[PDB]
Design a binder for these strands. Sequence first.
RNA 1: AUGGUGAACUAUGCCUGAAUAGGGUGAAGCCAGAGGAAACUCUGGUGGAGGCUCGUAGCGGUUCUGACGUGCAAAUCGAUC
RNA 2: UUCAAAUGAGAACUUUGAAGACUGAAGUGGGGAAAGGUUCCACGUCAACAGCAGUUGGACGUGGGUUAGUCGAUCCUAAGA
RNA 3: AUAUGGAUUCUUCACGGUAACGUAACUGAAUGUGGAGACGUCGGCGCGAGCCCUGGGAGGAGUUAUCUUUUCUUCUUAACAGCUUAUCACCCCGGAAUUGGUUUAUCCGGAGAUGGGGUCUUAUGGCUGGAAGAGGCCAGCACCUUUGCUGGCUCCGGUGCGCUUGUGACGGCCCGUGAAAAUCCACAGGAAGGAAUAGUUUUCAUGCCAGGUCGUACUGAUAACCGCAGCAGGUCUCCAAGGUGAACAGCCUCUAGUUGAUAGAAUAAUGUAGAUAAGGGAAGUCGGCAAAAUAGAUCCGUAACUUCGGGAUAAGGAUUGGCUCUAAGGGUCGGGUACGAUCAACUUAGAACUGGUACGGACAAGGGGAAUCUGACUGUCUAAUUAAAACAUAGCAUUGCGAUGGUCAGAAAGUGAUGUUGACGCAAU
Lengths: 100, 77, 91, 50, 112
Amino acid sequence: QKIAKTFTVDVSSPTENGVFDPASYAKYLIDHIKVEGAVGNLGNAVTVTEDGTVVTVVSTAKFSGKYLKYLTKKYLKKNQLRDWIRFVSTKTNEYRLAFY
Amino acid sequence: AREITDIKQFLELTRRADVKTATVKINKKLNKAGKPFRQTKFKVRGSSSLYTLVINDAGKAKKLIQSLPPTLKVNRL
Amino acid sequence: AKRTKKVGITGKYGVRYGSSLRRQVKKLEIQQHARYDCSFCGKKTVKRGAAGIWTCSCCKKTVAGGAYTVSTAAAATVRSTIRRLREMVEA
Amino acid sequence: AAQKSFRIKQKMAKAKKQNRPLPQWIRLRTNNTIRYNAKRRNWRRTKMNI
Amino acid sequence: AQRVTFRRRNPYNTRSNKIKVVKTPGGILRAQHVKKLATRPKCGDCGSALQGISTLRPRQYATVSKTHKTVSRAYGGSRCANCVKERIIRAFLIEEQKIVKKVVKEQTEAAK
RNA sequence: AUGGUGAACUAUGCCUGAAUAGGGUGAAGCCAGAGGAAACUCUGGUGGAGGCUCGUAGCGGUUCUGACGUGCAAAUCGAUC
RNA sequence: UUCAAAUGAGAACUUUGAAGACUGAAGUGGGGAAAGGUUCCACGUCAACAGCAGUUGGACGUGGGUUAGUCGAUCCUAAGA
RNA sequence: AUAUGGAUUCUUCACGGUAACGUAACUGAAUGUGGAGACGUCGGCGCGAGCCCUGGGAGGAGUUAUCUUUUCUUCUUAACAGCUUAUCACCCCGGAAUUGGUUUAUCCGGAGAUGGGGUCUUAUGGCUGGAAGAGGCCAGCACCUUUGCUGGCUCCGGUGCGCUUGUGACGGCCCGUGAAAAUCCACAGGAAGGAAUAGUUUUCAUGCCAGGUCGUACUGAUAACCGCAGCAGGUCUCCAAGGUGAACAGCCUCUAGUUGAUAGAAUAAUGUAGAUAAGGGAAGUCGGCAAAAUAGAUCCGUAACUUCGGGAUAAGGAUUGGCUCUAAGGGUCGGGUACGAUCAACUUAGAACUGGUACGGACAAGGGGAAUCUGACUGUCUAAUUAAAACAUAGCAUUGCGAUGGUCAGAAAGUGAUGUUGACGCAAU
Ligand SMILES: [Mg+2]
Ligand SMILES: [Mg+2]
Ligand SMILES: [Mg+2]
Ligand SMILES: [Mg+2]
Ligand SMILES: [Mg+2]
Ligand SMILES: [Mg+2]
Ligand SMILES: [Mg+2]
Ligand SMILES: [Mg+2]
Ligand SMILES: [Mg+2]
Ligand SMILES: [Mg+2]
Ligand SMILES: [Mg+2]
Ligand SMILES: [Mg+2]
Ligand SMILES: [Mg+2]
Ligand SMILES: [Mg+2]
Ligand SMILES: [Mg+2]
Ligand SMILES: [Mg+2]
Ligand SMILES: [Mg+2]
Ligand SMILES: [Mg+2]
Ligand SMILES: [Mg+2]
Ligand SMILES: [Mg+2]
Ligand SMILES: [Mg+2]
Ligand SMILES: [Mg+2]
Ligand SMILES: [Mg+2]
Ligand SMILES: [Mg+2]
Ligand SMILES: [Mg+2]
Ligand SMILES: [Mg+2]
Ligand SMILES: [Mg+2]
Ligand SMILES: [Mg+2]
Ligand SMILES: [Mg+2]
Ligand SMILES: [Mg+2]
Ligand SMILES: [Mg+2]
Ligand SMILES: [Mg+2]
Ligand SMILES: [Mg+2]
Ligand SMILES: [Mg+2]
Ligand SMILES: [Mg+2]
Ligand SMILES: [Mg+2]
Ligand SMILES: [Mg+2]
Ligand SMILES: [Mg+2]
Ligand SMILES: [Mg+2]
Ligand SMILES: [Mg+2]
Ligand SMILES: [Mg+2]
Ligand SMILES: [Mg+2]
Ligand SMILES: [Mg+2]
Ligand SMILES: [Mg+2]
Ligand SMILES: [Mg+2]
Ligand SMILES: [Mg+2]
Ligand SMILES: [Mg+2]
Ligand SMILES: [Mg+2]
Ligand SMILES: [Mg+2]
Ligand SMILES: [Mg+2]
Ligand SMILES: [Mg+2]
Ligand SMILES: [Mg+2]
Ligand SMILES: [Mg+2]
Ligand SMILES: [Mg+2]
Ligand SMILES: [Mg+2]
Ligand SMILES: [Mg+2]
Ligand SMILES: [Mg+2]
Ligand SMILES: [Mg+2]
Ligand SMILES: [Mg+2]
Ligand SMILES: [Mg+2]
Ligand SMILES: [Mg+2]
Ligand SMILES: [Mg+2]
Ligand SMILES: [Mg+2]
Ligand SMILES: [Mg+2]
Ligand SMILES: [Mg+2]
Ligand SMILES: [Mg+2]
Ligand SMILES: [Mg+2]
Ligand SMILES: [Mg+2]
Ligand SMILES: [Mg+2]
Ligand SMILES: [Mg+2]
Ligand SMILES: [Mg+2]
Ligand SMILES: [Mg+2]
Ligand SMILES: [Mg+2]
Ligand SMILES: [Mg+2]
Ligand SMILES: [Mg+2]
Ligand SMILES: [Mg+2]
Ligand SMILES: [Zn+2]
């Protein structure tokens, strides 16, 4: 009935060219991820961390993989990094930023 | 195009003299609601009908494959 | 709620053909559509199905009658005339 | 058209064969008089009446 | 968005050229020509669709086992059971009345 | 005048097929109700009739006596109908 | 309708890419019936033809292409002959 | 062609069910019979499929100065087979007035209703087999190549006066009642043929062989046909997305397809096609020819006259955007022998606010009224100068004719139409 879903991102390959900093990135998520309306409403219902090489996202609230690819598409857009990094799906529910 | 379920009647089929060739297929499908399990389908091909027997039970699966007549041309997978 | 004063089923022909032709047709239409008594099972289940052919909703007997009415005057009087003449050949 | 008698397919076929340029070697024959092929038809210039 | 074409030469919409649209395993819409429907065999007596019997196009009835073409009573796949009830009674009563008819008129002959 | 060839156009019948948005009207039948001494008379529903109607596609071809009138065309084009 | 490239002796007209539009599923879409008979497809190719052009074409030259027990015919009977 | 298994028989040609009927089988000659083939139209109502719309999720794509858990897109399942699945119809029990059951549409019952329980058709659908191995969508490596290789995901739902189409149970209509034959099956029949030392049985299952001939390309039309032609003509049909809207209308769009039609420069007169005009308002003209005016919808109002059906959108009026609210109209479950819980739908009326008083804002879309003449009406015709008052029609009336006949065809005929006819008829006015 309840359930928590877990979404990972392997930001390694573009972080290790300096050009991607996972500080402001998961930071972006934290206060931009909307929650039944608007930002800041992560009432312990949604959480984010960064495993240095990986950004983790965990949720009990309405949250999809497709959503993730959307917010971060926009980060990648905000800091000019489109062209340079795709958001992609390796195995189901497990994603990663692709450089080259 | 036929489906069989009597494991006996199956074996008899596999030895039916016009039955030169079979083919085992394996499928990952889920169990009830949760986890997965290995499904296997035994397909004897007859002059007219192609019979296929589903052993949902991985064990009855393995023990069935040795029961397969040594002179039957099984195509595994 | 009385829908038409006098055309009745004849209201379909609207204005055309002139009153008196519609009077004549109305009479015989009223005759031909209407449901009749079964001389056999005795339910009023007799409706027409082309001129002179009356059948029975249930019990399914089919009787050959007049063109827009089940029994036609002349027929009936023949029925009585034949009755009569028949008697002459028993007594 | 389209769904054809054998008979017509046959006429059709024969007509194809005759629809070729003079074979240029006849030109070189002693006393050869024939210049071009003067009986050639084009499908959209002359229908061939079955 | 996805349209369809006939599958045989006949371009017109005759009875014998009904279509049915279908989704194939290729993910696409294809046509399929439908045979005219079968109608149910009827009773020789009354005329109802007589039950028990299967309903196929007539030649198909020869590619089908006999039980699909009868019920296990006198006049199986032919007359409508209630219609057999009747003809059985009538048979019985009429043959009786005949006996009644004979000895009555046998009597008529000796005493007159 | 004689002997022949045409119903691929068109006229008519017969056989076998196929085709026609969306609206307007609201005929018989039917249900419930109201008045009245009575005879009987009313009302609201339902229903869905018609060589009915507005109007496409269709089929037509009214007017411009419109275009064209050595044409797109030996009969067409436009608007209107 | 337009920009550019490519090809070519030659490019308003061919090919490609871009742009601007159209038909708007009652289609300028996808198939067929009659009728055509190779028009299909590839390759070559411009003397005539496509009422400007032409490197393009339903043109010219040369080849290739139509696979069924189940789809049609074949059988059946209609008006009819 | 055929054997093997099964089924059947010592009660020889099966059993079971009260019955409707059931089934894997469960002999069947002549002859007879029945069914299928096999059938109009329209109307609403019911259901199926494809489409349309939509939620979650799992992928890929786009926009992101700013806003959008967004926009777009993939998420499929053939014939065939097994079980299952139905409106109708039928059976068994039962015996009904306080009549009941009941459709949107009033029909049904002592010739047995309501009720409870059964039987059947298998349209249709579900699940499974076919069948994920296919197809669809992605990701990660490889290298001139043929081109590979490896991974995943391919899931679960919702909505209905939707659209197209199929079908069903009905209902309207007829002086119209809406093919034939091949072919298949079933029944009535019982000729004959069959077992215990072993018989029948190929309508049950499984197995064996074979299936000729001809067509099969493409166009199907503003260039593949007919019009002397790559002619603005003509020429039978099927499939059919989104919005606005009553809609297959017009206008805009996705898919697909086009972007073909000599070109350049100017913008005189005169034209062809499209428009507007002060004040007047038909004075123009043979004549309001052309043109303009009108128009949707909701509401209000509506004359003469009439065959009472009409006349009628008569006439004559008001109103209409946006935005923000109010109210009414439905479904699904458990209640011992009053109500609550939840889901999903645009209609209609009312009320505020708001604007250069605009709002069927493009598109779409009737001018009305009073008379005379004349045909009743719908319908017909001079293809290519006449669409009318002409023809037709129903209605009326007249004539001929009982078959050895009326009317009519033929050179003749053992010839033919009416005639599958018979005066409520055929023929002639
Ligand atoms: Mg789609
Ligand atoms: Mg075809
Ligand atoms: Mg049966
Ligand atoms: Mg059955
Ligand atoms: Mg018997
Ligand atoms: Mg003709
Ligand atoms: Mg039809
Ligand atoms: Mg309509
Ligand atoms: Mg009273
Ligand atoms: Mg109507
Ligand atoms: Mg009309
Ligand atoms: Mg009209
Ligand atoms: Mg209207
Ligand atoms: Mg309209
Ligand atoms: Mg027209
Ligand atoms: Mg007409
Ligand atoms: Mg005109
Ligand atoms: Mg003129
Ligand atoms: Mg001129
Ligand atoms: Mg018009
Ligand atoms: Mg050009
Ligand atoms: Mg457009
Ligand atoms: Mg349109
Ligand atoms: Mg074109
Ligand atoms: Mg041609
Ligand atoms: Mg070509
Ligand atoms: Mg040249
Ligand atoms: Mg040419
Ligand atoms: Mg030229
Ligand atoms: Mg030239
Ligand atoms: Mg050539
Ligand atoms: Mg060639
Ligand atoms: Mg066939
Ligand atoms: Mg043959
Ligand atoms: Mg048995
Ligand atoms: Mg028979
Ligand atoms: Mg019959
Ligand atoms: Mg038929
Ligand atoms: Mg099939
Ligand atoms: Mg029941
Ligand atoms: Mg019972
Ligand atoms: Mg409804
Ligand atoms: Mg249709
Ligand atoms: Mg009928
Ligand atoms: Mg039958
Ligand atoms: Mg004998
Ligand atoms: Mg057999
Ligand atoms: Mg083809
Ligand atoms: Mg084609
Ligand atoms: Mg073309
Ligand atoms: Mg031509
Ligand atoms: Mg010619
Ligand atoms: Mg043309
Ligand atoms: Mg095209
Ligand atoms: Mg031109
Ligand atoms: Mg010019
Ligand atoms: Mg003025
Ligand atoms: Mg004035
Ligand atoms: Mg005046
Ligand atoms: Mg004057
Ligand atoms: Mg004058
Ligand atoms: Mg005058
Ligand atoms: Mg005018
Ligand atoms: Mg004005
Ligand atoms: Mg008036
Ligand atoms: Mg308002
Ligand atoms: Mg409410
Ligand atoms: Mg008030
Ligand atoms: Mg008239
Ligand atoms: Mg008229
Ligand atoms: Mg004329
Ligand atoms: Mg003339
Ligand atoms: Mg006229
Ligand atoms: Mg005229
Ligand atoms: Mg008169
Ligand atoms: Mg003679
Ligand atoms: Zn009766």
